[PDB]
Design a binder for these strands. Structure first.
Lengths: 139, 245
DNA sequence: TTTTTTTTTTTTTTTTTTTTTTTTTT
DNA sequence: AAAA
């Protein structure tokens, strides 16, 4: 699930290790979302990736529903006497595991796992280095 | 709402419809502005233009859905050819049940027959009506989907029905305080609804008697065996009970 | 002078795990 | 249906 999350939102988050030795999360701010004044089109430091936590439980459910309907469609099509077993055990295990994404502990574990995938080396020390770029309130 | 969530899981006839629309009807997405679309589903407010095979497959599933309950908002727009899709939201004085007596029906059958005489001619009477149990009583809807005359010709028919006083006394015989204005001036130019489709915060209508008569060019003045939804529907030229008059 | 603040002192632990776990064989 |  962490890999699917990274491949699905790899362009908005970045992770690096600070001097103290703890991973930190930076989020890219885009127009049309709640935010403080003046950080548009700029990376924002976040102690805990709240948006990723919400997105895991909100948008991923559509992909899970797509998987469920895909399994249903293959169940409808008649192939043999083995589909009625394989595409019933697989289905059952799937709805049993479907509710797992809504658990808090599973979400924390997924975030911790995804910390590695989103990590980008040489990011913190390269922040605000070149003196020819200024952060303004509109870009 | 809460009920709609139930049929999506509890039963599979609605689920059967879901598979068909997600795969087959999906490629037939049609713009809302264009009039080419023949299916307008108000569940999601989407317009669909289905060919004969995609239509009949849609129609077939509809009857089974109705036999097992559920709620649907599927509608079809009035096209350039259709039957006498003339809605009559009869605002009665009180909710007293007026019986669709064959003598009273023959009064309505012959008068609407008279109106279609002074127009293009060379007849299945589908008396669907509201389940009542509401102030203003029910809305009678006679449908003759066999013929193909859905143009400005029906606007003259619309005017003739609206200006008609012979039907007015027949409705007065039914205790209706609104003999006219039941037939909307755009009755045969606005989108209609397939039989068995639930309405906005209202139950789907029922058909009292789906009888039929015969018309002859020389001498003008003359049920569980067919899929009801297609038979009442105007686009179904290949209908079994109805024929494209 | 200068006098003591700073350095220290805490403050960084909790989140998994565990539990359960329906199922599955008996 | 009860035990693992």
């Amino acid at each position: 699930i962490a890999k699917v999350i990274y491949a699905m939102m790899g362009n908005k988050f970045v992770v690096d290790v600070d001097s103290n030795g703890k991973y930190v999360w930076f989020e890219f701010v885009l127009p049309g979302q709640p935010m403080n004044q003046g950080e548009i089109w700029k990376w924002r430091k976040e102690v805990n990736p709240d948006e990723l936590h919400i997105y895991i439980s909100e948008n991923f459910s559509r992909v899970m529903d797509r998987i469920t309907e895909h399994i249903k469609y293959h169940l409808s099509q008649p192939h043999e006497s083995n589909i009625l077993n394989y595409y019933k055990k697989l289905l059952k295990a799937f709805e049993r595991s479907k509710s797992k994404i809504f658990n808090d502990s599973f979400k924390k574990g997924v975030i911790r796992q995804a910390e590695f995938l989103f990590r980008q080396r040489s990011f913190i020390q390269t922040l605000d280095t070149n003196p020819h770029l200024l952060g303004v309130g509109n870009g | 709402t809460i009920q709609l969530t139930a049929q999506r899981k509890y039963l599979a006839e609605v689920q059967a419809l879901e598979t068909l629309l997600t795969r087959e009807l999906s490629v037939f997405l049609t713009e809302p502005g264009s009039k080419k679309t023949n299916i307008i589903n108000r569940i999601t407010g989407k317009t669909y233009a289905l060919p004969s095979t995609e239509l009949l497959r849609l129609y077939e599933h509809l009857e089974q859905c109705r036999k097992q309950g559920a709620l649907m908002y599927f509608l079809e727009r009035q096209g350039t050819y259709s039957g006498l899709m003339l809605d009559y939201d009869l605002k009665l004085n009180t909710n007293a049940v007026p019986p669709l007596e064959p003598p009273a029906l023959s009064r309505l059958c012959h008068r609407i027959f008279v109106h279609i005489k002074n127009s293009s001619v060379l007849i299945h009477f589908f008396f669907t009506l509201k389940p009542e149990v509401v102030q203003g009583k029910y809305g009678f809807h006679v449908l003759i989907p066999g013929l193909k005359l859905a143009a400005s010709t029906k606007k003259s028919i619309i005017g003739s029905l609206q200006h008609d006083a012979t039907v007015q006394k027949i409705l007065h015989e039914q205790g209706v305080t609104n003999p006219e204005s039941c037939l909307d001036p755009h009755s045969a130019s606005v989108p209609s609804l397939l039989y068995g489709s639930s309405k906005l915060n209202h139950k789907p209508y029922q058909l009292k008697t789906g009888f039929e008569l015969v018309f002859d060019s020389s001498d003008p003045d003359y049920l569980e065996s067919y899929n009801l939804v297609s038979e009442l529907s105007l686009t179904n030229e290949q209908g079994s009970l109805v024929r494209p008059v």
